[PDB]
Scaffold this active site. Structure first.
Site, short mmCIF file in Angstrom:
data_model
loop_
_atom_site.label_atom_id
_atom_site.label_comp_id
_atom_site.label_asym_id
_atom_site.label_seq_id
_atom_site.Cartn_x
_atom_site.Cartn_y
_atom_site.Cartn_z
CB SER A 267 -1.00 -0.02 1.14
OG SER A 267 -1.89 -1.11 1.01
CB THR A 268 4.55 1.96 0.15
OG1 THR A 268 4.85 1.03 -0.91
CG2 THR A 268 4.84 1.35 1.51
#
Ligand SMILES: [Br-]
Length: 534
Positions: A267-268
């Protein structure tokens, strides 16, 4: 009569000038065996003067035949032994003291992956220096850069072999003329030794990588791969057994996790996907959908689960970033398609070498249809698109690639090359690093960068922020974004930058299979506090 003078290897410094790679003097006693009257008698005479053991003789005896044909009688000498030889020089006309330089790494394993090491030149290096047509310049040189900075800047650190016209007997008596060697150039790194040591402590017993950058320069303030090893034992000519011990450790100390660790960014990536979706106009600031906690691949029975089991409800992009909503990004991936999403992530440098000045780097994989056909002999399905939307699927990145995409976000699409070189010493002047690349993604004034960063501000600071717990009490405001990459235990990832107002530090960290102990948000807060408080 005319002989090569080895140049001294440039030194390597941290950003404040702390020496990181040094040369030390080793003294040895030397003679040409033929030019000696009574070799066996001469050796017995030397026993008392320089503490010459049977093993000093053995190691010389083994060298006299093995030498094509000066040989080391004794190596290493104490200064005391040199001083006792020098007042008895007249007694040994065919025997001199030689001074040599051996590389030393005083912070050892804290900097193994960044600085690297030099190692003894072998036949393969000789062949390659021949092919490159510079072997004459390595005539008096024993060691060469095999890893890290020592390798990438080998040509800068080596310098120029010089020449002396000397008279013999058969040991040198005096110097007729000298064409000086030119010393290798010193390198000053962007590294903060204090921050580096501190971070290796925090990672102890974790398989981990951390990259700390100054987003105004792209300078690397820290670059830690954990587990590490002692670089000094490679200067010492590493044994088969020690090398194999390193090569077979399951923790893989040899791998630079920061530049060669390839992991799902998870999810970065959602901040960069947002900016890309907004810039492609596939969403606006306001574009809302309802999340029930799962997402049906439209026209197919596949269900994709959000992390929040009963969903986040009505989401704009801002809230999807604060709460790390998967459902919103499954939709955005589906709408954008692999082609536009792959192309936009490629602009952020995913699937690309970063340009970092180390030769140990992997590119990872920003998937495309072409690539899937090529590699896996099937075509691309809508299924393949959806996991890519939350940084999983075929998508792998290095920590240094994640650090670079964040710097790009912070600088509104102005790309900084991550770099370790602060300055080179050229002729007694420190010449600063200058970025040669001048790339710009979209438009600086788009305000889409701000939406993505306000999202990250929210992750750290707002009460629905997934990272609010890690950043309670900060005198500065942090912006962050986390991710979990499954493979037994999930990898834990965080990127973050601070002062949000005007960033001076950005961090990319991964704990492989979670922290040995601490959480990646604990560690990120400890790093931001170290730099911005003290
Ligand atoms: Br020199």
């Amino acid at each position: 009569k005319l002989v090569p003078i080895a140049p001294s290897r440039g030194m390597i410094f941290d950003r404040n000038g702390t020496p990181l790679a040094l040369n030390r003097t080793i003294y040895q006693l030397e003679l040409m065996p033929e030019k000696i009257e009574n070799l066996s008698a001469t050796l017995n005479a030397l026993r008392p003067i320089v503490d010459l053991t049977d093993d000093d003789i053995a190691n010389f005896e083994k060298e006299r035949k093995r030498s094509r044909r000066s040989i080391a009688v004794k190596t290493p000498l104490t200064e005391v032994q040199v001083a006792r030889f020098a007042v008895n020089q007249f007694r040994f006309p065919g025997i001199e003291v030689k001074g040599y330089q051996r590389r030393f790494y005083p912070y050892g394993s804290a900097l193994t992956h960044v600085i690297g090491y030099v190692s003894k030149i072998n036949d393969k290096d000789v062949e390659r220096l021949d092919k490159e047509g510079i072997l004459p310049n390595y005539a008096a040189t024993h060691d060469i850069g095999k890893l890290g900075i020592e390798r990438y800047y080998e040509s800068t650190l080596h310098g120029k072999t010089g020449y002396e016209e000397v008279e013999v007997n058969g040991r040198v008596i005096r110097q007729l003329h000298e064409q000086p060697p030119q010393a290798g150039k010193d390198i000053y790194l962007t590294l903060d030794l204090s921050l580096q040591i501190y971070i290796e402590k925090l990672l102890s017993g974790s398989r981990a990588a951390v990259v700390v950058t100054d987003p105004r320069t792209g300078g690397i303030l820290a670059l830690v791969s954990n587990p590490s090893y002692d670089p000094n034992l490679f200067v010492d000519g590493i044994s088969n057994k020690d090398y194999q011990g390193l090569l077979n450790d399951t923790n893989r100390p040899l791998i630079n996790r920061a530049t060669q660790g390839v992991y799902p960014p998870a999810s970065t990536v959602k901040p960069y996907i947002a900016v890309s979706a907004l810039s492609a106009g596939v969403i606006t600031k306001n574009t809302s959908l309802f999340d029930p906690g799962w997402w049906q691949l439209p026209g197919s029975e596949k269900r994709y689960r959000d992390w929040k089991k009963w969903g986040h409800g009505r989401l704009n992009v801002t809230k999807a970033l604060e709460e790390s909503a998967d459902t919103f990004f499954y939709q955005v991936a589906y709408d954008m398609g692999i082609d536009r999403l792959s192309s936009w992530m490629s602009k952020f440098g995913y699937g690309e070498y970063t340009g970092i000045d180390l030769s140990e780097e992997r590119a990872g994989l920003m998937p495309t249809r072409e690539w899937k056909q090529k590699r896996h002999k099937k075509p691309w399905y809508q299924g393949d698109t959806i996991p890519v939307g939350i940084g999983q699927g075929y998508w792998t990145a290095t920590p240094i690639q994640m650090a670079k995409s964040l710097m790009t976000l912070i600088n509104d699409g102005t790309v900084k090359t991550p770099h370790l070189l602060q300055s080179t010493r050229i002729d007694g002047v420190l010449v600063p690093y200058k970025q040669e690349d001048s790339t710009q993604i979209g438009s600086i004034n788009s305000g889409y960068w701000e939406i993505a960063k306000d999202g990250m501000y929210g992750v750290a600071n707002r009460p629905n922020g997934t990272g609010r717990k890690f950043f309670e009490g900060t005198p500065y405001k942090a912006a962050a974004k986390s991710g979990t990459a499954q493979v037994l235990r999930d990898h834990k990832l965080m990127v973050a930058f601070a002062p949000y107002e005007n960033p001076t530090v950005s961090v990319a960290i991964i704990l492989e299979n979670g922290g040995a102990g601490p959480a990646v948000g604990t560690i990120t807060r400890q790093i931001l506090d170290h730099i911005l408080l003290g």
